[PDB]
Structure 1
Amino acid sequence: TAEQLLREAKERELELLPPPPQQKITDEEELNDYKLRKRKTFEDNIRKNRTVISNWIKYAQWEESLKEIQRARSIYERALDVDYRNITLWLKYAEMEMKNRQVNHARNIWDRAITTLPRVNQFWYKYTYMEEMLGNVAGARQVFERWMEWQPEEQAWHSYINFELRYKEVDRARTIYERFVLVHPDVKNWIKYARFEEKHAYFAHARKVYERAVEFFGDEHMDEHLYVAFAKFEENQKEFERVRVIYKYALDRISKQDAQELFKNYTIFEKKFGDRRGIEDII
């Protein structure tokens, strides 16, 4: 214990010098000369390694701090001009320009990043930040055109349709949800459109779209796809004909009735709901 403790005391006394913070911001332009020496040290540190991330980030923080706009925009513009890939750094510089009081060149710079590599990360995230900042109808329009241009999405598309739906009206978000769901059909998209259409009242186009979507997506067996929607609209509207048709179509499913417990718990749910008791439901 005396060896480790002695190493703790000697290590604690091994620090080299305290700071000498004297004459802080004094003698008028002398502070600007100290800022010129510090900016020179940062320029030499960024000069030692052209691939340096850290030093560039510190030059961006100290820049935006003491360099106001011009020289700060020169640091973010030089580092941004020296960085093509690794768009996360472009998101750091975009966040530094977003904190400025202008924000016009920050939004236009966000559009320049949209024309740049989208990465499907900083484009949707930065687009959501700009749209949340201002330009509701415009930001959702360019974000919907961009997201509708290169590839579809899942959490970004569903979250974009949710934010566009809660914004003002769900009318346009219904057609956009039908186009996005039609671009990448799946059971989750049918359940989402059936849930939003369920909270939308209606349900005529939700049931017709449920049968039409269940018919076009049929390949091997329905299982959690059609039976979940048939039970949702069934138990929602309390229709025995839809429960009997769903139970009849579920019995025709291949691959050992598709999922065992799924169709069993669903047939027991609609069974117990509709009639149950003995006789038929017992056999």
Structure 2
Amino acid sequence: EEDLPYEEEIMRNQFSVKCWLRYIEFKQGAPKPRLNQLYERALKLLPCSYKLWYRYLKARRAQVKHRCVTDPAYEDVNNCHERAFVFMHKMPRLWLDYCQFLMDQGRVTHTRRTFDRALRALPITQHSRIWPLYLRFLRSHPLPETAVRGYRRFLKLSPESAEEYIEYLKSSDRLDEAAQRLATVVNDERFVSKAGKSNYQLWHELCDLISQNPDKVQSLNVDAIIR
């Protein structure tokens, strides 16, 4: 019964944002699963709406996040996000939000997949938004092959990230890779440093790691480099 004034308002005037907000506020007083079915019906009617998808996923996450970590209801919200990615296209907000929400679930496998699908979906400009979160995500795991491939991509946009990659290789004990990159950097004298380090100091740091570690460093003619 009580749906029918708002249903008539919405079906006669689908572009009336005020009529949508009126019914959403009405459903906020109602029990919230019917609001989710409203959003299901609303997105069937108006999938291109930025406002409908953003509010739905915000409401979905805020309800579910208090539940048990293993609860299937999180996968329902995920299925909404999958559908959200389909309609919304260029709008950055959902791409960021879903990856963050899967980190809250600890779903490492699916978080990477959503990053990898975001990179596949969108231009390099959108990638530049993705990579700060994704590299910060990749560092937090013992997944060095994935982080190596991710770090490499950023370097031709961000030279300062090569310092972060060398520091990542140092902390991952991948000193042989770190020696290869830093020797390339020391030859690439146009390099830019967040510490402002000189090319002599970078070469010094190169020799600091190398002279400590003849065993680990193996791809390089150490004698030639120091001569």
TM-score over 0.5 (shorter chain): yes
Cα distance in structure 1, aligned partners of 2:172 and 2:198: 16
Cα distance in structure 2, aligned partners of 1:89 and 1:232: 54
Q: Deviations over 1:128-151 (max 9, x none)?
A: 233123252222231232133133
Q: Deviations over 1:11-63 (max 9, x none)?
A: xxxxxxxxxxxxxxxxxxxxxxxxx44x3443344356321234323423432
Cα distance in structure 2, aligned partners of 1:65 and 1:231: 67
Cα distance in structure 2, aligned partners of 1:207 and 1:174: 17
In the other structure, the counterpart of 2:92 is: 121
The structure-2 alpha-carbon separation of the partners of 1:52 and 1:195, relative to structure 1 and needing over 3 Å to count, comes to: farther
Number of corresponding residues? 196
Question: What amino acid is aligned across from residue 7 of structure 2 in structure 1?
Answer: E
Q: Is residue 55 of structure 2 the alignment partner of residue 89 of structure 1?
A: no
CA positional deviation for 1:121: 1.4
CA positional deviation for 1:125: 1.7
In the other structure, the counterpart of 2:128 is: 154
Q: Deviations over 1:216-272 (max 9, x none)?
A: xx6xx71537x8573563454676xxxxxxxxxxxxxxxxxxxxxxxxxxxxxxxxx
Contact 1:42 1:55 in 2 (8 A): yes
Q: Is residue 106 of structure 2 the alignment partner of residue 131 of structure 1?
A: no
Alignment of 1:8-47 (within 5 A): 36-37=1-2, 39-47=3-11
Cα distance in structure 2, aligned partners of 1:235 and 1:58: 67
Extract structure 1 runs of 4+ deviating beyond 6 A: none
Percent identity, aligned pairs only, is 16
Q: TM-score, normalised by structure 2?
A: 0.66
CA positional deviation for 1:76: 0.4
Aligned to 2:169, which of 197, 200, 204?
197
Q: Structure 1: which 5+ residue stretches go unaligned?
A: 1-35, 240-283
Question: What amino acid is aligned across from residue 164 of structure 1 in structure 2?
Answer: L
In the other structure, the counterpart of 2:190 is: 222
Computing the radius of gyration over CA atoms, which structure comes out larger, 1 or 2? 1
Cα distance in structure 2, aligned partners of 1:66 and 1:196: 51
- Pairwise CA RMSD of aligned residues? 3.4
Cα distance in structure 1, aligned partners of 2:82 and 2:26: 26
Contact 2:9 2:19 in 1 (8 A): yes
Contact 2:135 2:151 in 1 (8 A): no
CA positional deviation for 1:64: 4.5
Q: TM-score, normalised by structure 1?
A: 0.55
Q: Is residue 20 of structure 2 the alignment partner of residue 78 of structure 1?
A: no
Cα distance in structure 2, aligned partners of 1:148 and 1:89: 24
Contact 2:144 2:172 in 1 (8 A): no
Question: What amino acid is aligned across from residue 157 of structure 1 in structure 2?
Answer: W
The structure-2 alpha-carbon separation of the partners of 1:224 and 1:49, relative to structure 1 and needing over 3 Å to count, comes to: same
The structure-2 alpha-carbon separation of the partners of 1:208 and 1:121, relative to structure 1 and needing over 3 Å to count, comes to: same
In the other structure, the counterpart of 1:22 is: none
The structure-2 alpha-carbon separation of the partners of 1:49 and 1:155, relative to structure 1 and needing over 3 Å to count, comes to: same
Q: Deviations over 1:136-186 (max 9, x none)?
A: 2222231232133133423421321212321x315244323244336x443
Cα distance in structure 2, aligned partners of 1:233 and 1:96: 50
Q: Structure 2: which 5+ residue stretches go unaligned?
A: 65-72, 209-227
Cα distance in structure 1, aligned partners of 2:48 and 2:95: 17
Cα distance in structure 2, aligned partners of 1:188 and 1:58: 50
Question: What amino acid is aligned across from residue 233 of structure 1 in structure 2?
Answer: L
The structure-2 alpha-carbon separation of the partners of 1:178 and 1:163, relative to structure 1 and needing over 3 Å to count, comes to: closer
Question: What amino acid is aligned across from residue 10 of structure 2 in structure 1?
Answer: I
In the other structure, the counterpart of 1:140 is: 111
